[PDB]
Amino acid sequence: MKFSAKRLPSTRLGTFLENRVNDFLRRQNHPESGEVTVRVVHASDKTVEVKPGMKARFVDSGEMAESFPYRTKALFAFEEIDGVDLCFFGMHVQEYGSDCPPPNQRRVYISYLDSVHFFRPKCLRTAVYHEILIGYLEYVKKLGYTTGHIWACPPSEGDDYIFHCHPPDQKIPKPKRLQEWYKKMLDKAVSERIVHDYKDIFKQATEDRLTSAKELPYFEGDFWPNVLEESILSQKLYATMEKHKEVFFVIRLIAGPAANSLPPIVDPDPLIPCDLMDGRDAFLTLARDKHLEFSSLRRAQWSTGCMLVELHTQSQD
Numbered sequence: 182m183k184f185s186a187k188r189l190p191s192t193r194l195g196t197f198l199e200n201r202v203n204d205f206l207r208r209q210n211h212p213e214s215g216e217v218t219v220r221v222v223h224a225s226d227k228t229v230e231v232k233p234g235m236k237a238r239f240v241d242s243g244e245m246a247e248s249f250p251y252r253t254k255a256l257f258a259f260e261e262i263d264g265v266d267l268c269f270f271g272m273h274v275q276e277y278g279s280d281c282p283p284p285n286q287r288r289v290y291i292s293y294l295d296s297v298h299f300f301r302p303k304c305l306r307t308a309v310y311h312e313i314l315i316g317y318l319e320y321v322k323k324l325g326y327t328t329g330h331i332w333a334c335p336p337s338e339g340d341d342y343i344f345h346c347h348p349p350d351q352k353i354p355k356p357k358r359l360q361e362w363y364k365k366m367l368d369k370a371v372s373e374r375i376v377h378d379y380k381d382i383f384k385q386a387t388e389d390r391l392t393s394a395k396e397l398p399y400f401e402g403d404f405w406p407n408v409l410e411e412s413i414l415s416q417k418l419y420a421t422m423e424k425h426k427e428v429f430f431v432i433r434l435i436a437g438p439a440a441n442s443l444p445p446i447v448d449p450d451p452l453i454p455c456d457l458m459d460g461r462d463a464f465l466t467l468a469r470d471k472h473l474e475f476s477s478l479r480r481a482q483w484s485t486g487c488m489l490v491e492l493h494t495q496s497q498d
């Protein structure tokens with residue numbers, strides 16, 4: 182292969198995740214399984230500027246910063262089936278480091294999560310996604326991020342997160358499974374002493390004695406900005422946090438004393454400037470354009486190829 186998944190530029194994140202997976206796979210000793218290559222394909226710096234009315238209430242009065250500088254990263258899992266690569270799992274993340282003011286100091290928030298259900302074998306499918314996610318929650322806990330945040334949100338019909346045109350027979354999870362599927366992922370992270378504990382947003386906030394909306398983390402296109410702005414008031418937020426708690430996790434990686442003695446986070450990985458994988462829209466555009474689909478396996482093997490072709494010559498700029 183001239184343009185293969187492996188032959189993409191490596192990173193310390195990319196190598197850390199693909200290790201834990203092949204480590205997990207090799208011990209399972211299923212003969213159908215194959216090599217999983219994990220790559221970071223976009224890393225850049227960004228901010229999430231506070232919205233007009235939250236701004237007016239707290240930013241203008243001095244009590245809150247006007248924006249929060251995070252690093253965005255896009256990363257993809259590729260299996261080798263029939264001796265050809267298959268992009269099976271993508272993930273977009275916001276990383277708010279130590280130099281970020283509160284209340285985004287040392288937090289990761291997963292922008293987006295997606296899959297194409299042709300990972301082999303299909304019994305290890307869900308298991309492998311869990312490794313990639315615990316592997317990311319482990320990686321960042323070691324760099325020294327205290328808290329992770331997940332919006333447990335299933336996709337809508339007629340719209341896709343990352344991959345254009347999913348398999349017709351790959352069913353979307355109903356809210357209650359997706360919640361159980363994350364709880365499934367986390368309870369395993371807890372047993373490996375990676376996660377200290379996790380809580381729904383309401384319980385976390387009930388136990389952190391939050392008395393102001395400026396204390397609630399403020400992520401890019403997360404639910405809670407839109408709620409606070411549509412609210413324009415602490416009660417209103419305790420109503421909404423309570424009603425929706427089950428969808429919004431707070432994953433504590435570093436706890437108690439060890440959280441206050443932290444040296445500053447230093448991401449060792451360099452920035453990967455990539456036009457295509459800057460947010461979800463530009464990649465969905467290219468796939469729509471060039472008639473690409475992840476509908477069938479052979480179609481998905483086609484698409485990963487034309488995805489990599491485009492990636493290797495946009496890096497070469």
Ligand SMILES: NS(=O)(=O)c1ccc(CCN[C@@H](C(=O)c2c[nH]c3ccccc23)c2ccccc2)cc1
Nearest residue numbers: 294295296334335336342347351353354358359362
């Ligand atoms: N709870 S579960 O055990 O069923 C399960 C299994 C695997 C996964 C891994 C991620 N999978 C995607 C996903 O399927 C889809 C995204 N866009 C779609 C459009 C049409 C049909 C499907 C998709 C996904 C699903 C939910 C939320 C984000 C991304 C997740 C959950």
Ligand SMILES: [Cl-]
Nearest residue numbers: 292293294334
């Ligand atoms: Cl998601």
Ligand SMILES: [Cl-]
Nearest residue numbers: 253459460461
């Ligand atoms: Cl983005």
